[PDB]
Each structure stands twice: as C-alpha cells, then as structure tokens.
Design a protein around this ligand. Structure first.
Ligand SMILES: [Ca+2]
Length: 223
C-alpha cells in the first residue's frame, strides 16, 4: 500500500496473509473454513496466516492453518487477469474471535464514488521498494467505469473496477494482491493489477466480487 496508514493491530480481522515460506499475497476470510484471494496468487504449499499484524513477529493472536485445497475460478485468464479470483479451503476451521473474523459477501454491486478500505503488507513505495512488517490501510473511492476504461483502454472487463486517485500517490501495490477491498462492510473487490503503483492516471484495478457470489456459494456448498 503506497500512501496509506498503519491500520492498527487486528482492526482488519478478515485480512489474511498467504505464506509459502514468506508472505506473498493477501486474502479475505469469508467464513471459518474459506479464504477468497486472487487467482494470480495461486501457489501450491500455501499456509494461511490469520490474526496477523507484524508478519515478522509472533505477537500472540495468530492462527497458522495450512490450505487443504485451492480452487482458481474456472474462467480465470492469467493474460488479461479476467476472473482473477480463487478460493482457498483451510485444513481445519479457524477459531473466530475479536481479532479473527469473517467478512460478508455482497448482495449488490458497489456504487462509483463509494469509499472503500484496501489493506495489505505490500510495497509502500511508487518508485523503489520498501515492505512494511505491519498491516497498512488505504481508503480509496471506486472510479466510474468510463474513467477506468479510459485509464486502461482495451483492458477492462465487466469483472473489474478501478479505485484510487488519478493524480497518483495513493494505491495498492505488489504484495497486496489478493487482499480485500471492503465497501459498506462487504467484500466488493480483490487487489488484482495496475500499471506500476500510485502513478498518475493509472489507478488500481480490482476483481469485482459481486459477480462471483453464486460461484463462491455453490463451490463452498460442494467442497
Ligand atoms: Ca505476527
């Protein structure tokens, strides 16, 4: 997250870290057994880390639970990032508590102009590199589809939305992928892609979770 703020330990209790020996992507806990992340975060060997604030210090509220199954969307296209969504099943159910909690899935799609909360342990620099240990947060508005398409001509599908600031300076970034975009208390987006981070005229692009609620619900009813 570039241009964000330190969230505060466990204030984003649905945020998970995906770990393969190291943090590599975010995700969102949707119930005690399942995480939603980006399909481009797929790896074998994933451990889900819940209750994290500093990902490099064991502070006392973590739950570390191996994935048993990952399910990339059936129509995921890694070239365009269309349908950039994955489900991860935990080997055992998390213990839900004040610091480890699920986020609701949406009923309706979020509205242009709505401010959402984006979070993660990704790079905090637009130019260069610096990875924070503690979770960072950013409030950012959903942009109109017309503005989004104009920023990325020939690249935006109806399964994507842009959010952020066209003047630059505030965005998600590498290492935030797969994490939550929460708007009116529901999971509306997944950190997916963008040209650079926090550059002018290049806002973040997010998987549009409201398009996937029927696939999520039938898949979790079935696995
Ligand atoms: Ca920790």
């Amino acid at each position: 997250i570039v241009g964000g703020y330190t969230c505060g330990a466990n204030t984003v209790p649905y945020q998970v870290s995906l770990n393969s020996g190291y943090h590599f992507c975010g995700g969102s806990l949707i119930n005690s057994q399942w995480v939603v992340s980006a399909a481009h975060c797929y790896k074998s060997g994933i451990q889900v880390r819940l209750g994290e604030d500093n990902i490099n210090v064991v502070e006392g509220n973590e739950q570390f639970i191996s994935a048993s199954k990952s399910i990339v969307h059936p129509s995921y296209n890694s070239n365009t990032l269309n349908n950039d969504i994955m489900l991860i099943k935990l080997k055992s159910a998390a213990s839900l508590n004040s610091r480890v909690a699920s986020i609701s899935l949406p009923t309706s799609c979020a509205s242009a102009g709505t401010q959402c909360l984006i979070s993660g342990w990704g790079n905090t620099k637009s130019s260069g590199t610096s990875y924070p240990d503690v979770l960072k947060c950013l409030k950012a508005p959903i942009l109109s589809d017309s503005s989004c398409k104009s920023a990325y001509p020939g690249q935006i599908t109806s399964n994507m939305f842009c959010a952020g600031y066209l003047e630059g300076g505030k965005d998600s970034c590498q290492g935030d992928s797969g994490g939550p975009v929460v708007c009116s208390g529901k999971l509306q987006g997944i950190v997916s892609w963008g040209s650079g981070c926090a550059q002018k005229n290049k806002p973040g692009v997010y998987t549009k979770v409201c398009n996937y609620v029927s696939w999520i619900k039938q898949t979790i009813a079935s696995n």
